[PDB]
Structure formats: C-alpha cells, structure tokens
Amino acid sequence: EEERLEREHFWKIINAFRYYGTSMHERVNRTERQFRSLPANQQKLLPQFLLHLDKIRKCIDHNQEILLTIVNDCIHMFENKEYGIMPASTFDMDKLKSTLKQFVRDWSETGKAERDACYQPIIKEILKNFPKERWDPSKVNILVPGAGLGRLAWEIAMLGYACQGNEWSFFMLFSSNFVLNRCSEINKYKLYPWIHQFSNNRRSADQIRPIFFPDVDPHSLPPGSNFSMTAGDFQEIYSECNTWDCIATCFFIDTAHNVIDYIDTIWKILKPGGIWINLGPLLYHFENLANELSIELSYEDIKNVVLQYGFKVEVEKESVLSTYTVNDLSMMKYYYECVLFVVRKPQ
Template sequence: MAETTGEGPEGAPFFNKDRIKNSPEEEAKLERKHFWRIIDAFRLYRVNVQEQVKRAERQFLSLPKHHQDLLPDVLSNLARISQCADHNQDIMQAIIHNSLHMFENIEYGEREDPRKLRPSSTFDMDKLKSTIKQFVRDWSETGRKERETCYKPIIQEIQKIFPSDQCDVSKVSVLIPGAGLGRLAWEIARLGYICQGNEWSFFMLFSSNFVLNRCENVNSLTLYPWIHQFSNNKKSSDQTRPITFPDVNPQSLPLDADFSMVAGDFVEVYRDPDSWDCVATCFFIDTAHNVIEYVETIWKILKPGGVWINLGPLLYHFENMADELSVELSYEDIRTAIVNYGFHIEVEKESVQTTYTENDHSMLRYIYDCVFFVARKPADVYCNGREEEDDHLQSTPPAAKSPRREGTDTMT
C-alpha cells in the first residue's frame, strides 16, 4: 500500500504504518512494482558482489608495490570470491525461475520493459545477502546447532502440550508467523501436526518456495554465504567456505502431512477468531511496528485454551527508521500487556542464549539472550481479554496455574 507522512488528525503524525487506502487497481500496481523490484535484486546479485570485488582490487592495487609483494594471495582470493558469486547467481536464478506463478491467487504478469533492470538499493541487496544466510540456518548441517537452540525448545513444548499418545495430533493446528525459509514449520508438520507458515518478505517467500518445492536431493546444492563478509576473517579461505543444502529432503513429509505456507502481513491475513490451537513465534515479535498489535492478533486467533509459544530477542526492526512507526518496549512491558490482555503465562525462561545466521568461523559473533515463554488463552468464557464473571461458577481454569519458571541454562 502507498505510504504517507505528515500530520494526522489533530496534529498527530502519520507514520508508514498509517497507509492510504488505494483503489484495487492502484494496490495491484504497487504490489507488482514491489514484486519486480525484488526480482531485480536477485538478478543483479552477481553485479553487486563483483562491484565489491573490483573495489577491493582497486584498493589493493593502490598500495605501494613492495606492500603488494608481501601479500601474494590477495588477488587470487578476490578472484575466488568472484567465482563463488557466479555460482551463487546460478542459485539466485533458480530461485526466481518459478516465482511468477508461485502464488495461487495472484499473477504479476510481465514487466513493462523486460530488458531494463532497475538498480537495486543497498537495503534490498543487504536483504538478499541476509536471505542467503538463512539457507545456512534452516537447511544446512552447519545450521543444526542454531536450530537446536532456537527451534527445538518450541517443538518440545508443542509435543509436551499436545502429546501424540494423548491426542490426535493431526487435528492440532499450529501457526508459525515469520516462518522464513520454513524449516520450523516443516519440522512441526513432519511430526503430524497441522502446520502453516506465514511470511511477508518476498525474499523469504521466493527462497522458501524453491527449497520446499524444488529441492529433492540431499546436499545437492551449494552456496557461498560468507563471501560478502570482508571483515573479521581469520583465514582468507573462511570467506569462500561453502555450505551444501538441503540437509534433508524437504519433500519427504508423510503423504498425509498438512503443511502450507501463506504469504502476507500477519495481522492482515489472520483475522478469523478462535482458529488455532497454537501460535509459535521465533525471532518474530520484534518485527512489529507495534508489538501489542501482535499480542492482540494472537489472542484473537487462538482457540480458547490455545497456547502461544515464543522465543526470541527484542531487536526492533523499525527502530531509528525515519517516518516508520516503531514502539520499542521492554520485555517487562510486553509481559505486562500479555497478562493484562488475559493470557496466563505457564512457562517462562528469561535467558536462552542463541545465535542467528551465525558465521561460526568469524572473529565477531553476536549472542542473543532470548526470552522463552508459553502463554495460554484461558479455556473458560472470556470477553475482550477479561474472564466473564459468573457468581455461580468460581472454578479455576487449568491455564491459571502458577507459571513454571525454569532455570537460566540454555535449552538444547
């Protein structure tokens, strides 16, 4: 949708979350323009990396000759980076090859001038390079440790709440907003649960469509995800280190598996009340302009007695972005809002240390000290986040038991 800035009613500022309502035709035009912008980023990936390489070559060749002579391998390593970019470009082309028809209800048609590629912004190219690292996290053996710390606690909690020996898991519905390349949702579906991943980013949607629907042979494809990192390399070879994917066959789900991916903005797509048994969010809630809007949506779509499982930090995506609505709340504030809305927190762990698309050979690593919690929507009658009072029935719902606060050691 078109975005606006300026002054709102009574002098209140408009931010990009406050959007002009356009005609369906204008909406379709804007969506098509965005679609092709992302396609162009994939197509121009190699050009962007080659520009980086050429710049590095120029910088090196500007050194005094006797300094260059002390570094005999620099130019050959840069040539290797360029070769790796060529290979990555082949994967980028494969990803977008079937993208025109990947959505069931939308056709983006042909671009106005297929011969003209629009230059990609630094923002879009950074997004694409970040997406390449998502293949490491979700679909490579290298990312196994990261998945163990991020995904396994969520999966174990789902199995604990909905055990296969006590309920028909094929009737338990689990929603994964911000599903990325789909590995967490895929793992849950593999266990027999109904699972749907939701994703908004075209970068992620194109890539997840490729790996989930076009990749069958285990470790048959190669990417070089670290060639964009020119700093903090212990060895030159670390920069051109490959990963293979997928580490499993994504199409090996049981024939009766109920697994799907849905494109769109979480708060706009999911509006049907009392629809899901479980909503699981992993590194997701800080993508909100307004986290409370996520809390509100999750409350609405959960069935009575349903659970919200969350793991992640609070690295707000829109912080310090001009004209973007962004309310940066502490976990303490968010927890208060969750409880005030009516959720009962059953499990809470305030120190789960993990990484995100980590380069385990880098001299610089980020460790996220994440919050993990399970919050239940009460199973009894409620209204607008408050239980309706009944003088004749004062029983305590199972969800209202004391929170289970676990230790601070990392879950694996």
C-alpha cells in the same frame, strides 16, 4: 491499490535478486582497485591476493546462479500469474545477503546447533501440550507466522501437526518456495554465504568456504502430513477469531511496527484454551527507520501487556542463549539471550 503495490514490491525484489552479481562484483573491484594502488613492494608481500579475489568472484557467480534459479521458479508460478530494470537499493542488497545466510540456519547441517537452541524448545513445548497419547496431531492447528525459510514449520509438520507457515517478505517467500518445492535431493545445492565478510577472517579460505543444502529432503513429510505456506501480512490474512490451537513465534514479534498489534491478533485468533509459544529477542526492526512507526518495549512491558489481555503464563525462561546466522569461524560474533514463554488463552 492493494494488488498494484503488491505487484510493485514483487518486481522490486525480483530485480534485487537479479542485481546481486553486479553489486558484489563492484565491491571486489573496489578492493582490487585499492590493492593495486599500493606501493608495489607491499603488493609483493601478498602474492596470492589477486588470486583470492578471483576465487571470490567465482563464488559471487555461483551465488548469482542460485538466485537466478529462485527468480526463474517464481516468475513461472501457477499462482504468480497475477503479477504480470533499475539498480537495487543498498537496503535490498543487505536483505539479500541476509537471505543467503538464512539457508544455513534452516536447511544446512552447519545450522543444526542453532536450530537446536531455537527450535527444539518450541517443538518441545508443542509436544508437551499436545502429547501424541491424547491428541490426534492432524486435528491440532498450528500457525507459524514469520516462518522465514520454513524449517520450523516443516519440523512441526514432520510430527503430524496441521501446521501452516505464514510469511510476508518476498525474499523469504521466493526462497522457501524453492527449497520446499524444488530441492528433492540432499545437499544437491551449495552456496557461499560468507563472501560478503572481509573483516575478522582467521584464514582467507574461511571467507570462500561453502555450505550445502538441503540437509534433509522436504518431501520426506510422511503421508498424512498437513503442511502449507501462505504469503501476506498475518494480521490481514488471519482475521478469523477463535481458530488456532497454537501460534508459534520464533524471532518474530520484534519485527512489528507495534508489537501490541501482534499481541492483540494472537489473542483474537487463538482458540479458547490454545497456547502462544514464543522464543526470541527484542531487536526492533523499525527502530531506526525514518518515517516508520516503531514501538520499542522492554520484555517487562511485553509481559505486562500479555497479562492484561488475559493470557496466563505457563512457561517463562529468560536467558535462553542462541545465535542467528552466526559464522563460527569469524573473529566477531553476536549472540542473543532470548526469552522463551508459553502463554495460554483461558477457555
């Protein structure tokens, strides 16, 4: 039951990767169809339009190649031997499009500013509580749930902490497995994360511009590094109590069906005296989804729940600005005024 539904989920994501080209091409063919239905005099006002559509198509083909490399990597895994054709949902295609942007955030020089706003404060808090002068960082155990493409877990590991990223989503697992285990040359790969955006373009070239990755070799972890990634629901995988020195969550807790469940887990699996570092907003992932449990709390209520569990609050900064896979050439942008806090389980 567990293993079969995992198996179903698995090939569904695979199929979604395989379907990216068909989806996007149909979108561009809608556009070409409509453009050609215009009065011809209007089409001659834009004598480069059809050419630009052809450049998008090449971009789609290139993105599809990256996605097929990821699919090829995960099918032939040493530990994916346990798992063994339909059109993907529009929901999967959106997750796909989100995945490609995630490569900018986590593994491109283009996403350094965003990492500076979201990751530096977490890393800064870790160094504050486990200073190199008093702690062998190899003996400090740090769990990073919802690690995504894994850049933050990786950065912690670069300092020598015994860091383990966990992730539930096969979009994220397929991709991080590829970037972390196969990209051993800086900026060897390239993708087009903005071709999906047709609104709010200053220049048409803006939509077809590339980003390169990885800006950094993942295998430049120094010897003595202790870095790993796990696949599964972190509530089910990390059930052993009193284990972790530090749990670090970035844009994570608003992905729960019930964030109270998350807080209950973090309390049980922290070592007495350990800390929970959090940075992020409260965009509840299940808010709209029919037939899904979604408990949407204000930050005020989250703090009250944290306080009642017994945590003691060491750092609290509200209005920490950051973006999330922003396109800095776009005429429309979203930003977050995140909360950062460091709470501590009493010893």
